[PDB]
Structure 1
Amino acid sequence: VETFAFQAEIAQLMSLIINTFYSNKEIFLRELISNSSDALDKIRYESLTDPSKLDSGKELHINLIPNKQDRTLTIVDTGIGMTKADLINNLGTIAKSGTKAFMEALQAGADISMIGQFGVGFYSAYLVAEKVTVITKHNDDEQYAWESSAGGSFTVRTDTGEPMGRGTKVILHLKEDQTEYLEERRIKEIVKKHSQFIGYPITLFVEKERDKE
């Protein structure tokens, strides 16, 4: 297991999100679905000139999986996935130009929904999750797990769980006061409100239901 420090302003932002009350938390799901959609676009365009890039799975889609027993909401996609280097670089160690401006905007009363416009959309996960685990598989790298409960660092390790062919799974270990995001109707209404124009199928597990479509 390897441990990495978040870039200082990203650590500051995470602390702010965790320790300051914001309403409109539901936008975390929009932000994670947008990341899945971007990752799906990436592999889709790569496959146009190299169809073998889909040998690890031709289906391009997003699954939403609430688990009441474990108190987790998982967002799974069959997108491009992240290499080990991608995880380390893109999910915490590299500065984002908009972080300080976003924190200033929040102090001045901006809605937390603006997070994506400032280039730090992923960190919305910490509005509702005490811990986030990201399991990811990119072509020509092994499967990896990134994890953080905030507090300034994250870990990366090779994953020995169930193999994914290709893509990313973001596992949200929800705070005890945010279990509404495990409910079928709640998830449906947030997807309808915020993610209605995503151009890939989105499936909800309750047994299994295509949204919606």
Structure 2
Amino acid sequence: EKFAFQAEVNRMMKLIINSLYKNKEIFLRELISNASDALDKIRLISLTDENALAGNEELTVKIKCDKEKNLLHVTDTGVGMTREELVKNLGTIGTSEFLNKMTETSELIGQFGVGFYSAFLVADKVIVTSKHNNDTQHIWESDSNEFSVIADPRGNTLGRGTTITLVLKEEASDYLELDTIKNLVKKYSQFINFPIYVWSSKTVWDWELMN
């Protein structure tokens, strides 16, 4: 259940963090982009697999702030990841060129698709809960010094998809405020082909479409 990151990933995390230290709000853009890509994947799979969406009929991205618990959640109903894929996609990585280029960054991060790691700019801990059609629900967690993957004792709660949960750093508290999040979500979801919602307040509470 316990794993060490590949050397290349450790180097990558430091590069990403040291480069975007002055543009931290970009992590949200990357998580939303990853979510969109995951949704494109299942949409493609559904063209050839009629039962592809049986675990969850919607294709959405839902974001909610848990201020009390100091958590930010970004959930998509994309293709999801099996246990082996969580370990492979998040723990390992022409990567040498990218790194060479990085060390020698915002646009490059998005192009190589390693924007996930920018979450460490605002979080002391990142948790990834995922359910893929070929596996049971699992949880990946990391403080960046190592990571672990365990079967989710809550069972299959996602249906299908992935939830990125960020335990925000003391100084990243602003990202728990609806205004801030709504504002950022609207900016980075403008060109996403899937509907993105934010659990917001009007005091009654409900999902609010951002794009």
TM-score, normalising length: structure 2: 0.89
Structure 2 letter corresponding to 1:166:
R
Aligned counterpart, 2:58: 59
> Where does 1:75-94 land on structure 2 (aligned, <5 Å)?
75-94=74-93
| Structure 1 unmatched ranges of 5 or more | none
Aligned counterpart, 1:196: 190
CA contact (8 A) 1:99 1:119 kept: no
Deviation of 1:16 after TM superposition, in Å, equals 4.7
* 1:197 partner SS: coil
For residues 190-209 of structure 1, give each alpha carbon's deviation from its aligned partner in whole angstroms, at most 9, with x where no partner exists.
12222211111111012223
Deviation of 1:17 after TM superposition, in Å, equals 4.8
Deviation of 1:185 after TM superposition, in Å, equals 1.1
Residue 154 in 1 paired to residue 144 in 2? no
Partners of 2:78 and 2:137 lie apart in 1 by 14
For residues 56-109 of structure 1, give each alpha carbon's deviation from its aligned partner in whole angstroms, at most 9, with x where no partner exists.
01111010010001111000011000011111111112394455235414xxxx
Residue 173 in 1 paired to residue 173 in 2? no
Structure 2 letter corresponding to 1:72:
L
Partners of 1:133 and 1:88 lie apart in 2 by 13
The percent of aligned pairs where both chains have the same amino acid is: 51
Change (3 A) 1:113 1:179: farther
The number of residues matched between the two structures is 206
Deviation of 1:140 after TM superposition, in Å, equals 2.0
Aligned counterpart, 1:24: 23
Partners of 2:31 and 2:187 lie apart in 1 by 14
Partners of 1:78 and 1:21 lie apart in 2 by 28
CA contact (8 A) 1:17 1:126 kept: no
Aligned counterpart, 1:210: 208
| Structure 2 unmatched ranges of 5 or more | none
Partners of 2:3 and 2:76 lie apart in 1 by 25
Change (3 A) 1:120 1:180: same
Deviates more, 1:155-164 or 1:128-137: 155-164
* 1:54 partner SS: coil
Change (3 A) 1:167 1:190: same
For residues 32-52 of structure 1, give each alpha carbon's deviation from its aligned partner in whole angstroms, at most 9, with x where no partner exists.
111111111111111112221
CA contact (8 A) 2:17 2:118 kept: no
Deviation of 1:18 after TM superposition, in Å, equals 5.1
Partners of 1:118 and 1:43 lie apart in 2 by 20
Change (3 A) 1:140 1:69: same
For residues 97-156 of structure 1, give each alpha carbon's deviation from its aligned partner in whole angstroms, at most 9, with x where no partner exists.
455235414xxxx4x4642223321101111110000000000201110010012x2111
